[PDB]
Design a binder for this molecule. Sequence first.
Ligand code: PPY
Ligand code: CO
Ligand code: CO
Ligand code: FE
Length: 225
Amino acid sequence: MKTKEDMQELYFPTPKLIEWENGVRQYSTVRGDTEVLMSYVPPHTNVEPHQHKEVQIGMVVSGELMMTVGDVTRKMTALESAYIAPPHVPHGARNDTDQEVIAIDIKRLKADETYTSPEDYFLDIFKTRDLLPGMEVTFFVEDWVEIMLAKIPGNGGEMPFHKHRNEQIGICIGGGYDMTVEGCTVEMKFGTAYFCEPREDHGAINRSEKESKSINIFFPPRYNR
Ligand SMILES: O=C(O)C(=O)Cc1ccccc1
Ligand SMILES: [Co+2]
Ligand SMILES: [Co+2]
Ligand SMILES: [Fe+3]
């Protein structure tokens, strides 16, 4: 027995706003062992190095960010790179530009997961292709995680309703569309996050007049095994 509002809090949890002294603002959404943070990093601003037991996956959605993981510093272009900072590995960043950076982090710690990364921490685009006709996706791949950018066209662009054992978590980064998880449909906006546990049915349809974009993350990988 799950109410409408009950289900909303599970699959599309209400974010909290976090503000740091340095000026960074974060929108934080949580379900169980996984946290999604959308960060707004102001111009010419440092994010002090730190480290934690949780693994963290990061990506720039807008702007350009100087990112440090371990002793590897790398310029991050919007949506063209991701990094993984394994547990306890120190990491921080600087917005070294005149413009605000919008970024996304996933912080996670779940049993029976080994958190590896490329030797230099950063992932480049593995492959871009249509997942479904007209639906362009872009993959970033590790053993235990698969990042999939998706463009869902307007005018009926749709991911049919389905499920899989893979956990799938994500966040809308453009336009709008309807997403349903089990018995719950939400109109996604920029920043709306969703969390699907194993075997929870879900789908999406974009009945707007323009394409929408999303970031979707599989644990473990679903397409590039
Ligand atoms: O490929 C899947 O398993 C998906 O769930 C794809 C997807 C894309 C956009 C919104 C929801 C699901
Ligand atoms: Co961190
Ligand atoms: Co899915
Ligand atoms: Fe239309």
